[PDB]
């Protein structure tokens, strides 16, 4: 139960930070370009991305192992009863 | 149940529109810019993303609570059973 | 049970993939603009964010189905506890 809630909220920052890139982008084709701040910001945010993905994918494989041990528990309690 | 199932929907919805502003970047830099209509439908996808963003962020903090009671709910019905 | 993590899995392959547009439009910004291969590219994964949305929006219906008929079914148990 926790896995999941917490894997939204891991998603949900991930759209968050994806959605200042977005703006940065936005900004940038506006300007016709961007100058050393903007390459800073896009590389901060790029950072901050990447990692609640590596993060995301972590608890992904953490949840499926817990889905797995469930089924399994679930499946046995079913041939038991009969 | 209800509220990770709703959440999921926020999300699928905030990366739908995300996708669109997306397209709309990429024919900015096609295009070598965009007009009026192309900042016009910016700003609409990027109000409805960040209403998205808001909402999910609301029921992400319901989601936290519901998660926080039924923990506390379990880990009682855990001492008391001994 | 199934279906949420499995939600989640399209979710997070989603975003990934839309990263990688991202990538490919801050390229574009940054070389004022992109060749062949870089509309090559941008296809490409616009293609899989598309397939990946897609099967969301499928999977999300099918959790919501889920969802309506476990609530139906525990609303019955609850009428019937009296």
């Keep these: 139960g926790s896995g999941i809630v917490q894997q ?18 936005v900004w940038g084709i506006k300007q016709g370009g961007g100058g050393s701040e ?9 950072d901050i991305i990447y990692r609640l993905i590596e993060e995301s994918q972590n608890q992904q494989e953490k949840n499926e192992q817990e889905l797995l041990a469930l089924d399994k528990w679930a499946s046995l309690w079913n041939w038991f009863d009969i």
Tied chains: 1, 2, 3.
């Design 38 to 46: 903007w390459e800073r910001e896009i590389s901060n945010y790029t």
């Design 8 to 25: 939204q909220s891991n998603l949900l920052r991930a759209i968050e930070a994806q959605q200042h890139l977005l703006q940065l982008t």
